[PDB]
Structure formats: C-alpha cells, structure tokens
Amino acid sequence: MKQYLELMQKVLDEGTQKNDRTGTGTLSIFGHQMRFNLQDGFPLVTTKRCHLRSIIHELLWFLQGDTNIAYLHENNVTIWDEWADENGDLGPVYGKQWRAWPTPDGRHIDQITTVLNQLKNDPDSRRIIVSAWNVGELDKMALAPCHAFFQFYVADGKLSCQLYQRSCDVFLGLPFNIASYALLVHMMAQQCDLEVGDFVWTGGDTHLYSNHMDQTHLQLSREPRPLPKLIIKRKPESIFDYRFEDFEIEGYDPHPGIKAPVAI
Amino acid sequence: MKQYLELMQKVLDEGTQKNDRTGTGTLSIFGHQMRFNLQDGFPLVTTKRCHLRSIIHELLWFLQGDTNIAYLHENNVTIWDEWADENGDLGPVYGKQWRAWPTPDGRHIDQITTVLNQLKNDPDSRRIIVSAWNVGELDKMALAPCHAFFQFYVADGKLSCQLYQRSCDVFLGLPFNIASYALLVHMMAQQCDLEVGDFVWTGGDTHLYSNHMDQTHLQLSREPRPLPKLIIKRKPESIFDYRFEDFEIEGYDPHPGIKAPVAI
Ligand SMILES: Cc1ccc(S(=O)(=O)N2CCC[C@@H]2C(=O)O)cc1
Ligand SMILES: Cc1ccc(S(=O)(=O)N2CCC[C@@H]2C(=O)O)cc1
Ligand SMILES: Cc1ccc(S(=O)(=O)N2CCC[C@@H]2C(=O)O)cc1
Numbered sequence: 454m455k456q457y458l459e460l461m462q463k464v465l466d467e468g469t470q471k472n473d474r475t476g477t478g479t480l481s482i483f484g485h486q487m488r489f490n491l492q493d494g495f496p497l498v499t500t501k502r503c504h505l506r507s508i509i510h511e512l513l514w515f516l517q518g519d520t521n522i523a524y525l526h527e528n529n530v531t532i533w534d535e536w537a538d539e540n541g542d543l544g545p546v547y548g549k550q551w552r553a554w555p556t557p558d559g560r561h562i563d564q565i566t567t568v569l570n571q572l573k574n575d576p577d578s579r580r581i582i583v584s585a586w587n588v589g590e591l592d593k594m595a596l597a598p599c600h601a602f603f604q605f606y607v608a609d610g611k612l613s614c615q616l617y618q619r620s621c622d623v624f625l626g627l628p629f630n631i632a633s634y635a636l637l638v639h640m641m642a643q644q645c646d647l648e649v650g651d652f653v654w655t656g657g658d659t660h661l662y663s664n665h666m667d668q669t670h671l672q673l674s675r676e677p678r679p680l681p682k683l684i685i686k687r688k689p690e691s692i693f694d695y696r697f698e699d700f701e702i703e704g705y706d707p708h709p710g711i712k713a714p715v716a717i
Numbered sequence: 718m719k720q721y722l723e724l725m726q727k728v729l730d731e732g733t734q735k736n737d738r739t740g741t742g743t744l745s746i747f748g749h750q751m752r753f754n755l756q757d758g759f760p761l762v763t764t765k766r767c768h769l770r771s772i773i774h775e776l777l778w779f780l781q782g783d784t785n786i787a788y789l790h791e792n793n794v795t796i797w798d799e800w801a802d803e804n805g806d807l808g809p810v811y812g813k814q815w816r817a818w819p820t821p822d823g824r825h826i827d828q829i830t831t832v833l834n835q836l837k838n839d840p841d842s843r844r845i846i847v848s849a850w851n852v853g854e855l856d857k858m859a860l861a862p863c864h865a866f867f868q869f870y871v872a873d874g875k876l877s878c879q880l881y882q883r884s885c886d887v888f889l890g891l892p893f894n895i896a897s898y899a900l901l902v903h904m905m906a907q908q909c910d911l912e913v914g915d916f917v918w919t920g921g922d923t924h925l926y927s928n929h930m931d932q933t934h935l936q937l938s939r940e941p942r943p944l945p946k947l948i949i950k951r952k953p954e955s956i957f958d959y960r961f962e963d964f965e966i967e968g969y970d971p972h973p974g975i976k977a978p979v980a981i
C-alpha cells in the first residue's frame with residue numbers, strides 16, 4: 454500500500470544499523486505514524502500476497518482471552534508454536550491482558566467489555582483504551598507484547614483506533630499487525646452500530662532485518678493495487694461470538710507472495 | 718515552535734466539534750505525531766511565554782514516586798491542587814506507577830530504575846518502556862494518566878524517547894508536556910553518558926477548547942523564535958538526586974504570555 458511502501462523506503466533511506474536480541478542486524482528508525490481510512494478499503498498489503506487465515510483465528514483467540522495454543526492447534530494455526538511450552542502455554546500474553554488483567558486485589562479486568570461499554574455509553578471519552586502492557590506480568594509472558602496498547606475514538610458516527618507498537622519488523626510482521634487491528638475496528642464498530650473510521654498505526658523501534666533487503670527491494674518495485682473489501686457475513690450478538698467463517702475479503706488481487714527467512 | 722503551530726492549525730483546519738466530560742466543547746483530531754531533535758535546542762514554545770518552575774518541580778516529584786502534594790506545596794507549586802483531597806492525596810497517579818507499580822503478588826516495580834538499567838546494560842532493547850497505565854489502579858487515581866506511556870531508544874550514542882499522550886489540550890497542556898519529557902530525556906541521557914536524540918510526541922485525542930479560539934488565532938500570528946538551551950549545572954550521582962537549581966534555560970526570548978481561561 455502507498456503508506457506501507459513509503460515506510461519501507463524511509464527505513465532504507467534513514468534507518469541506522471542496529472542488531473536485535475538474537476544478534477541479527479537491522480536497519481532501524483524510532484517513531485513513525487501512518488493512517489488508514491477504513492472507508493477507503495481494507496488495508497491488506499497488495500504488493501505481496503498476504504494470507505489472513507491465521508490472523509483471523511489469532512484475533513478470535515485473543516478476544517476469547519485464551520493464551521494456551523490448543524485452539525490455534527485445533528485449526529492448524531502454528532504462528533505461536535515457537536513460543537509455547539510443552540503444554541501449549543504462553544504465559545499471560547495479549548488475550549489474558551485484554552480479557553482478565555489481574556489486579557493486586559484479586560480481580561480480573563475485562564478491558565474489551567469495558568471499552569465496548571464506553572463506546573456505547575460514553576463515546577466522547579478520551580480514555581477508551583486497552584493495554585497489554587501489564588508490567589508485573591511481563592516476566593511470565595513467552596514474550597512482551599509488541600502491539601502493546603490501543604485507544605479508540607468516536608467522531609461523526611465513525612470508530613477510529615490508534616495502536617502503539619513498541620517493536621515492528623516492517624517486512625514480516627507489519628502487514629499482519631495492520632490487518633489484525635483493522636479487522637478488530639470493523640468488529641467493534643459493527644457491535645456498536647458505528648461506521649469505520651481510521652486505523653492509526655504508531656511505531657516505536659521500526660525496522661527491516663538485513664536478510665530481508667532483497668525482498669524489500671523487490672516489493673518496492675511493485676505498484677500497489679486497489680484495496681480489497683472486508684465483508685462480515687453475519688452480525689453476532691456480541692464481540693465474543695464471531696466465527697472464522699463470518700469474514701470474507703473481496704477483490705484482493707495482490708502481486709505474488711514473497712518469503713522471509715529468519716535466523717535462529 | 719514550527720511543529721507546534723502546525724498542529725494548532727491542523728486542529729483548526731480539520732478538528733471535529735467534540736465536547737469533553739465537563740461539557741465544554743472542543744475541536745478535535747485523533748492521532749498526531751511530532752519530532753523534536755533535542756540537539757536543535759530545548760523545545761520550549763516561544764510563541765507565548767511558558768514558565769518552567771512548576772514543571773521542573775513536578776518532574777522531580779514524579780521521579781521521587783510521591784503522589785501526595787505536600788512537596789509541591791512546600792515549593793508553592795499549585796498545579797495539582799484541584800485534584801488533591803483534604804490530605805493532599807491524589808491516589809496512585811504518575812509517580813506511584815513510575816516508581817512502585819503494584820503487582821498481584823505484592824511487589825512494587827521501579828520502572829525508572831529498570832529503564833536506567835536497560836539503557837546502561839542493554840541499550841538496543843526494544844522494550845525500554847515506562848507505563849503509567851496501570852488498569853487495576855485507575856479507579857483510585859484522582860485522574861487517569863494523560864501522558865500514559867513512554868519508550869526509550871538508543872542509536873549512535875543518542876537517547877531518544879517517544880511519549881504516547883491519550884488526551885491533549887493543545888493550548889494549555891501541550892507546551893508543558895513537551896518540556897517535561899524533554900527535560901527527562903536530558904536527565905536520563907546525562908545519567909547514562911549519552912547525547913540527547915529526539916523527543917517524539919504522539920497524541921491520541923488532540924484538541925483545542927472552543928474558549929481558546931481567540932488565543933489560538935493570536936498565537937498563530939506570531940513567528941517562532943530560536944529555541945533556548947537547557948543547561949544542567951551539576952551531574953548528580955543518580956536520576957533521583959536532581960535538584961531544582963541544577964537546571965537553567967538560556968537564551969529564551971518568547972513572545973508575551975497568553976492566558977487560558979477554563980470552565981468549571
Ligand atoms: C468460558 C471460558 C472462556 C475463556 C477462558 S480462558 O482461560 O481463555 N481466560 C479468559 C477469561 C479468564 C480465563 C482464565 O485465564 O482463567 C476460560 C473459560
Ligand atoms: C503470519 C504472521 C502473523 C503475525 C506475526 S506477528 O510477528 O505480528 N505475531 C504473531 C506471533 C507472535 C507475534 C507478536 O504479536 O509478537 C508474524 C507472522
Ligand atoms: C524514601 C522514600 C521515597 C519515596 C516515598 S513515596 O511514598 O513517594 N513512594 C515512592 C516509592 C514507594 C513509596 C510509597 O508509595 O510507599 C517514600 C519514602
């Protein structure tokens with residue numbers, strides 16, 4: 454998409470040489486922001502084929518509050534496999550914080566229900582937020598949240614959402630992070646009887662791995678195609694009752710898929 | 718400053734009519750980002766005179782972890798007075814989360830010491846974060862954090878910092894929020910033997926109150942002046958040992974002060 458390609462070129466033009474925790478080098482910038490008007494079309498990268506099967510199941514699993522990967526394994530979704538222990542456990546990652554953030558007094562806070570409540574009854578609120586950044590639980594997590602916190606906003610009948618992503622692999626992860634939150638905006642909007650507004654993406658350490666440089670050059674030689682359209686085939690009674698089959702992407706005509714090797 | 722005035726004009730040009738919790742109307746945009754290269758000069762607004770006395774004491778008080786306003790009252794700083802109860806208490810706002818975030822198992826997490834530790838021993842980390850957004854404590858706070866979370870980053874000997882501000886009064890609060898975090902970047906950098914990099918400001922609901930419209934027009938008719946220079950007169954042994962008198966702003970030559978009335 455135009456904003457996505459502009460971000461790739463920016464990291465190439467001004468990223469600084471920086472290694473990750475593993476020791477794999479990257480080019481990196483700090484601080485970036487992009488906006489996707491969801492009424493312009495579903496923001497799924499067209500300059501390389503991006504599959505959404507895993508992303509849809511992942512979002513449903515996050516909304517359920519589950520951090521054990523057996524649901525993902527029931528559907529042969531293996532994107533969390535490398536972090537899961539023998540029992541399939543990941544510790545209190547994303548879903549556990551969204552639905553059951555543990556407090557010092559023994560409560561489990563349901564941030565998704567809180568924000569739906571706020572969107573329906575106090576849409577002008579400036580604190581319609583979900584955070585996965587639960588400082589006391591980070592040590593138990595298989596990994597600290599990369600998409601760490603997000604805020605909703607309502608204006609003129611439209612639902613917008615801003616995500617703060619502390620760390621971003623532009624080539625491999627970003628396309629999927631955008632699609633995931635854009636899907637969630639559509640689902641929340643449907644549940645609140647609102648139209649879709651903007652998805653605002655904000656990045657912290659935003660990088661390209663040095664072994665993705667050829668892939669990045671290839672993708673930058675391709676012209677974005679028209680954005681597809683998300684269709685929600687049914688309207689569930691709540692945000693927790695969406696099913697995989699409810700979603701259909703229409704008119705997606707991407708350039709060919711580009712693989713991304715990763716060091717271990 | 719140029720970025721600040723551009724943001725004012727943007728809210729005027731495209732903000733949407735939106736009320737706050739009180740019922741005072743605002744013009745509002747959602748999602749904005751600005752960058753201040755701290756090597757270009759200390760980012761204190763010059764198009765209106767901005768005082769930093771309260772801001773400096775406030776930052777020292779935040780770093781101490783104190784949420785009772787008696788220290789502020791010892792120095793005749795009254796900016797938190799309207800939120801404090803009879804004993805001067807505010808609940809577990811900013812400082813309490815920065816220094817002693819309470820966990821479900823009874824620990825109190827010192828996020829400032831954690832991040833200093835990370836900056837000195839693992840500067841490439843992509844998780845050098847402080848969050849004040851402690852979901853289980855929001856109800857006890859006099860008010861939910863507006864400057865809710867911030868991340869540090871190190872590249873080429875320079876310390877940068879990105880703040881996510883969920884709600885921003887562009888006229889009254891923003892000038893001060895920028896200066897506060899810019900001061901903290903200088904102090905953290907000094908303690909880590911690093912040069913200052915960028916302060917990246919990211920906003921969520923970013924607005925102008927409708928009773929600040931004349932003030933905004935007046936300020937937009939003024940040309941920014943050269944930025945001042947921050948001088949730290951002494952190097953304390955730690956980030957908790959800074960004193961009011963350690964800081965001096967040099968070369969600040971602002972246009973006249975502009976008052977901001979507020980409804981109650
Ligand atoms: C009916 C049900 C849903 C989801 C879960 S869970 O384990 O995914 N999680 C989400 C809410 C609290 C619960 C738990 O961690 O115990 C348990 C039961
Ligand atoms: C196909 C695919 C989807 C999503 C991601 S990811 O990097 O955004 N994500 C999924 C696994 C854990 C990781 C994360 O959220 O940190 C990677 C690959
Ligand atoms: C020596 C000292 C510093 C600061 C405080 S405090 O009340 O401001 N606060 C900060 C760290 C934990 C402590 C408390 O809330 O008890 C108490 C004692």
Ligand SMILES: Cc1ccc(S(=O)(=O)N2CCC[C@@H]2C(=O)O)cc1
Nearest residue numbers: 771796797862863864889890893894
């Ligand atoms: C002179 C002045 C400084 C700072 C602020 S503020 O809006 O950024 N701040 C200080 C009091 C509580 C409020 C806040 O951080 O939410 C307002 C006025």
